[PDB]
Amino acid sequence: SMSVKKPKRDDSKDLALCSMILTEMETHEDAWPFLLPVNLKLVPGYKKVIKKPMDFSTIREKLSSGQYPNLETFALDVRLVFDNCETFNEDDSDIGRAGHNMRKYFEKKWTDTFK
């Protein structure tokens, strides 16, 4: 509350650290379904079903242009990538498996870096 603050967590390396995580996600072999925006002209259903499309290149742009207010907002867009994936893909598909793999991969890097 007013003039009563929890001690100040050092957040000054978060930008860098999120960019590193994102680089590791971009360079994972199962990243391919997530590297670019899904082509909304060419994938029937995607536009209407997926309210908030997200992908790594878009996350990369937002990061790089100061569009993440903090590390939680960045984590949210990453998770959205995988939540969208699960909405549109069957678990027993290459893309659906990619999704699960990538989410596990991210969640580990997140915990080990920040928690």
From Swiss-Prot:
Protein source organism: Homo sapiens
Protein's UniProt name: Bromodomain adjacent to zinc finger domain protein 2B
Residues of the full protein shown: 2054 to 2166 of 2168
Domain Bromo: 9-113
Quaternary structure note: Component of the BRF-1 ISWI chromatin remodeling complex, at least composed of SMARCA1 and BAZ2B, which regulates the spacing of histone octamers on the DNA template to facilitate access to DNA. Within the BRF-1 ISWI chromatin remodeling complex interacts with SMARCA1; the interaction is direct. Component of the BRF-5 ISWI chromatin remodeling complex, at least composed of SMARCA5/SNF2H and BAZ2B, which regulates the spacing of histone octamers on the DNA template to facilitate access to DNA.
Stated family: Belongs to the WAL family.
UniProt-annotated location(s): Nucleus
Functional note: Regulatory subunit of the ATP-dependent BRF-1 and BRF-5 ISWI chromatin remodeling complexes, which form ordered nucleosome arrays on chromatin and facilitate access to DNA during DNA-templated processes such as DNA replication, transcription, and repair. Both complexes regulate the spacing of nucleosomes along the chromatin and have the ability to slide mononucleosomes to the center of a DNA template. The BRF-1 ISWI chromatin remodeling complex has a lower ATP hydrolysis rate than the BRF-5 ISWI chromatin remodeling complex.
Gene designation: BAZ2B
Tissue specificity as recorded in UniProt: Expressed at varying levels in several tissues, whereas a smaller transcript was expressed specifically in testis.
